[PDB]
């Protein structure tokens, strides 16, 4: 991915946004009760904590573009995934706007609790202003769609969230690059049925883990990924993606039978305009962040990548024997034979992809189910019923998390959510968590869910 140019909103005519740059994150009542070293990300260019130029930092992610069109390896790979997808009988026909906006079972309604696109946010127009669940009415969307048209600029801002201290000195905050509501709708109408089938079928045919419930999906993983596990991390996957990968995506959408109008939406994602504060800028390559299907399209692309990467690195690779699932840049795969990720990484770099050992591991050692990590979580077999797999969120992340809050009124919901994540680590550590929570007068006033009851409920899911 690569910025092509920058121009003042003055010169482009694009509407700016007058944000304040103040974090909504406050130290919580457990702030100094639990241990941690993260704090609110740097939100503006003058944060006293910056040891660098902010804008500099924010955009370093755009490491450039290496391929603009697929070699043979990427073509052979796009086909196999497309082929594999065929057995899904995916509904290639357009979605009603009503469904696209208000949801279905297996396609959730547009979130009224996040920003509508450009120019809506700049003009102070809200999602709730246009959408109403009670009426499921689309005439006002059509009106706004007809008004502002399509292929609008991704309005762009810094994510208000906790960062490590090193990511805060180095100004490594993250961006939210929201598509305009117009394109979100138009996109969902074009691919909403594909989204449904992906949401309904997390697993090894889709190669997707999007919209999965780890509570239960985790147990299915060992079964879906037999043989020799492998896995790595990407350094700025999204921004590192070259246009070749969007070409390769159209290839797949076409083989599975999508129309040429649907397929033309992929370019408006490969090739984008952003408005950050008041400069507008063109990006070419890489995938945006608050874009619809962003997760699904990323995952699909990752499903191609791992392929191309394989048949190119090695010889005698049989792709029918590759098992993967992907969630954006997060991957887990298996294969009958061990796969050298030290090599994949070398060959992957030729493509502009920075790949590194899984779980920040010192090198590309064997990944086994004991160390393996996916959606941040590990895999812990239940002690009594070993075939049931616990999703394990590290306590360290939970500790980091409990020390802050965007709303002090919300301490009860905040804590039980963290408990719903924590107990999976085992009784001994769950109690150690609860006990340090209950080590403070506020914590004792709290209703905290009990271990064996949490577990019971979980059993009932199977």
């Amino acid at each position: 991915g690569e910025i092509q140019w920058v121009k003042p909103n003055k010169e482009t005519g694009r509407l700016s946004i007058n944000g304040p740059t103040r974090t909504k994150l406050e130290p919580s009542v457990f702030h100094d009760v639990f241990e941690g070293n993260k704090e609110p990300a740097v939100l503006h260019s003058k944060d006293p904590r910056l040891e660098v130029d902010f804008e500099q930092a924010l955009f370093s992610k755009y490491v450039g573009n290496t391929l603009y069109e697929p070699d043979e390896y990427i073509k052979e790979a796009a086909l196999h995934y497309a082929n594999q997808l065929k057995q899904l009988e995916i509904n290639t026909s357009q979605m009603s706007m009503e469904e696209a906006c208000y949801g279905t079972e297996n396609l959730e309604a547009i979130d009224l609790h996040t920003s509508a696109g450009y120019p809506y946010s700049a003009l102070g127009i809200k999602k709730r202003d246009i959408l109403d669940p009670t009426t499921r009415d689309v005439s006002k969307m059509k009106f706004y769609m007809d008004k502002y048209g399509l292929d609008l600029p991704y309005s762009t801002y810094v994510k208000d969230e906790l960062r490590s201290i090193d990511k805060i000195k180095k100004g490594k905050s993250r961006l939210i690059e929201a598509s305009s509501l117009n394109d979100s709708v138009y996109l969902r109408m074009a691919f909403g049925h594909l989204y449904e089938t992906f949401h309904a079928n997390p697993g090894t045919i889709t190669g997707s883990a999007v919209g999965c419930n780890p509570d239960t999906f985790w147990s299915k993983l060992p079964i879906l990924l037999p043989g020799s596990l492998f896995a790595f991390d990407y350094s700025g996957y999204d921004a590192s993606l070259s246009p070749v990968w969007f070409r390769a995506l159209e290839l797949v959408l076409r083989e599975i039978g999508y129309s040429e109008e649907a397929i033309s939406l992929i370019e408006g994602i490969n090739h984008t305009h952003h408005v950050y504060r008041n400069k507008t800028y063109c990006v070419l390559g890489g995938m945006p962040s608050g874009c619809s299907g962003t997760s699904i399209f990323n995952s699909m692309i990752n499903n191609i990548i791992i392929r191309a990467l394989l048949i190119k690195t090695f010889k005698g690779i049989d792709l029918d024997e590759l098992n993967m699932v992907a969630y954006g840049d997060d991957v887990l795969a298996s294969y009958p034979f061990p796969i050298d990720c030290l090599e994949l990484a070398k060959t992957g770099k030729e493509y502009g992809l920075t790949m590194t050992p899984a779980d920040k591991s010192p090198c590309f050692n064997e990944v086994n189910w004991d160390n393996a990590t996916f959606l941040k979580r590990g895999f812990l077999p239940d002690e009594q019923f070993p075939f049931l797999i616990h999703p394990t969120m590290p306590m360290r992340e939970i500790h980091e998390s409990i020390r802050w809050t965007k709303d002090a009124r919300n301490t009860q919901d905040h804590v039980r959510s963290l408990c719903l994540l924590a107990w999976h680590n085992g009784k001994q550590e769950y109690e150690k968590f609860v006990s340090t929570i209950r080590s403070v007068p506020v914590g004792r006033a709290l209703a905290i869910p009990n271990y064996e009851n949490l577990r019971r409920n979980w059993l009932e899911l199977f």
């Binding site: 394989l310 190119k312 690195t313 010889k315 034979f337």
Partner: peptide, 20 residues
């Protein structure tokens, strides 16, 4: 794919594309 195969030759350890 992913599930079980069949025809019609044994699969051997992947072999690293050399030079090429």
């Amino acid at each position: 794919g992913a599930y079980s195969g069949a025809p019609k030759q044994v699969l051997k350890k992947p072999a690293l594309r050399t030079a090429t």
